[PDB]
Each structure stands twice: as structure tokens, then as C-alpha cells.
Design a protein around this ligand. Structure first.
Ligand code: HEM
Ligand code: HEM
Lengths: 165, 165
């Protein structure tokens, strides 16, 4: 991040922001299957080519609604973004196991996932949360808390998607 | 016939669909500068990396996008999509001058415009039209009319973005 970019940036993420992510996630969990669905239907609406990276041959599950990869993937983005918030809050940086990040970098690079894709997914995530939590709790602050967590997780993954030259 | 496009084969774009595109475009014209703006602000919101393919900021000492290059591109997508609808209606295929398509293929390939980009722009176009025309005229039919026009125009352009058939 070019706010004081060198090799170690100030990843300020407050307890309030984590709280925002935690209580909204708490409500979203009460209906996991449904939000995961809405989440991927939104990705597919914005970038059909994205959902095409998941296919459906092994399961042969053609319908998007029955594409297991989609549900599992939707949950991974939420859960890992929600953990990234907690990590930013406690450690000041994403702390995904080295092996786990290397595996995420390789997988996404292997599927041609680029910046626009990460951005569309973020847009769909934020849209899905806004659409799912009560209007009394959504706020720009909640939107930003999620965005910060997501953005940092993505940056960590992208790091294992290029040469550490 | 889920083949991306149809260089000249079967495609039934009706007079009603063209009418839908024409009258909505008619209303949108009455406020070109504003819809072009909302249109690109939407692209940037969904895929910031997209708007990064054009130019930064410089025009008349103001942050908001006053860059004439944007309004130009926004208008080209509308006008050419609107013309593609008329062409699908009259000829059953996009009829952009051979030289004009070659120039569009080369330009977009040269800028790394990919499938996700074309999809985000389509999403922003559809969102902008829905947001701009009166609720009494927007409908799934109008959305599809625009989508069909846009999709075929894009397929025509993409054809000049890859080695000959
Ligand atoms: C921060 C956001 C993201 C997170 C946390 C995430 C997480 C994951 C995880 C945990 C896997 C499972 C495989 C493994 O263990 O490596 C995976 C696979 C995959 N991801 Fe993501 N992903 C993210 C964004 C994206 C985006 C933007 C796309 C593309 C639109 C995408 C496409 C895929 C594909 C196609 C696979 C492999 C195919 C499969 O699931 O079998 N991911 N992702
Ligand atoms: C069907 C949709 C599209 C149409 C009709 C369209 C049309 C045009 C036209 C007419 C030009 C002017 C240059 C020339 O004569 O070749 C152009 C340039 C360009 N387009 Fe598009 N475009 C479309 C989609 C996109 C998308 C999806 C992006 C990327 C998000 C994009 C990015 C650009 C860029 C960066 C240029 C060249 C830079 C410049 O304008 O100087 N276009 N486009």
C-alpha cells in the first residue's frame, strides 16, 4: 500500500471495524446457504466469464445452483475475509499460513484470475452483505471494514502469484 | 445456439427490441454528459482496474471526471450498441465497416481488454440505463434488448482480436 509504501505498510484496522465485520458475519451465518448463493449469482451477473472458471464436470452439476465448488468457494471468500479482519485487528497484517497462501497464489494464477476478477468478487461480496444485513446495521463503515479485510487478503494472495523479484 | 456470435447466421432481434433501445437511448441523449459520467463511475466502482486502462486526471482543475476522453468512450459504447441493435434488426448481424472493426479489435487487444472487462462494461451499461429511464419503461425486455445488441457488437470486435477464423 502506497500510504507509506516500502516493504512494510501500516495496516491499521480497528476493533470497531472488526466488530462490524464480526456482527454482520454473525447475521450472515444464520443463513449461509442463501448468502453464498446470492453471492455467486452476483459474480455471474457481473462477470459470467468468472463463474466459468469453476465449471462442473466432476460433479456434472450444470445448474449454478448445484455447483458445489460455488458454495464452497463462496464460503471460503467470506470466512477467509472474516478471518483476515480478525488478523488485521490482532496482528496488523494478514496471517494466512505460508503454505496456504502459496496454494492460493498457485491456484488463482493457474485459473487466470486477474485484478478485474478480484474486484468484481469484492463488488459482489459487498453488494451481498448490504443486501443481506438489516438496513439498521449497514453503513459506509461496515462496507469499508469488509473492503479493507478483503483487499489485504487479496494482496497477500497476489504476492504468491508473481515473482518475489 | 449458444455460440458467442453469429457472423451472419440466425439471430432474431425484433423491431420491438430495437424500439426499446431507441426510445430509451432517446431519453438518455437528453442528458448525455450525465449518463456517460454515471456509466464510467459505475465501471470504476465495479472494476477500478478497468478505468485504469484509460487516463488519470487532467481537464479543468476539478477531481470529478471532466476528461473528454471518457465521455467520448462512454458515448461510443452507447451509440455503437444502439446502432448494433438497428443492424441486428435490419440485417440480422452486426454490420460495422470492416475497417472499423479491425481498428476496434486492434485497439482493445492493444489495451489488454478481456472478457471480464467487456462483461463489467455491459453490467455498467445495463445498470446505467435502468437507473436513468423511468421505472415505467424499464423492464426485463428492455434489459435483454440492450444486452443482445451489446453482446453481438462485442463478439464482432473480439473476432478481430484473435487470429483469423
Ligand atoms: C480473497 C478472495 C478469494 C479467496 C479468499 C479465495 C479462496 C479460494 C480457495 C480457498 C480456493 C480453494 C483451492 C485452494 O485451496 O487453493 C480457491 C479456489 C479457486 N478460486 Fe478463489 N478465492 C478468492 C478469489 C477468487 C476470484 C476473484 C476468482 C475468480 C473470479 C476465484 C476463482 C477460483 C477458482 C476457479 C478456484 C479453483 C477452482 C476450484 O475451486 O476447484 N477466486 N479460492
Ligand atoms: C462494445 C463495447 C465497446 C465499444 C463499442 C468500444 C468502442 C471504442 C471505440 C470506438 C474506441 C476508439 C478508438 C478506436 O477507434 O478504435 C475505443 C477505444 C478504447 N476502448 Fe473501447 N469500446 C468497448 C468496450 C471497451 C471496454 C470493455 C474497455 C475496457 C474496460 C474499453 C477500453 C478502451 C480503451 C482503453 C480504448 C483505447 C484508449 C483510448 O480511448 O484512447 N473499451 N473503444
Amino acid at each position: 500500500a502506497l500510504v507509506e509504501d516500502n516493504n512494510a505498510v501500516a495496516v491499521s484496522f480497528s476493533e470497531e471495524q472488526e466488530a462490524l465485520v464480526l456482527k454482520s458475519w454473525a447475521i450472515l451465518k444464520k443463513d449461509s446457504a442463501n448468502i453464498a448463493l446470492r453471492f455467486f449469482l452476483k459474480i455471474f451477473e457481473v462477470a459470467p466469464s468468472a463463474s466459468q472458471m469453476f465449471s462442473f464436470l466432476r460433479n456434472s452439476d450444470v445448474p449454478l445452483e448445484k455447483n458445489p465448488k460455488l458454495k464452497t468457494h463462496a464460503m471460503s471468500v467470506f470466512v477467509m475475509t472474516c478471518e483476515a479482519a480478525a488478523q488485521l485487528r490482532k496482528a496488523g497484517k494478514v496471517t494466512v499460513r505460508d503454505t496456504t497462501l502459496k496454494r492460493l497464489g498457485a491456484t488463482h494464477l493457474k485459473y487466470g484470475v486477474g485484478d478485474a476478477h478480484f474486484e468484481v468478487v469484492k463488488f459482489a461480496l459487498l453488494d451481498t452483505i448490504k443486501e443481506e444485513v438489516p438496513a439498521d446495521m449497514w453503513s459506509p463503515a461496515m462496507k469499508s471494514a469488509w473492503s479493507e479485510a478483503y483487499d489485504h487478503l487479496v494482496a497477500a494472495i497476489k504476492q504468491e502469484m508473481k515473482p518475489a523479484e
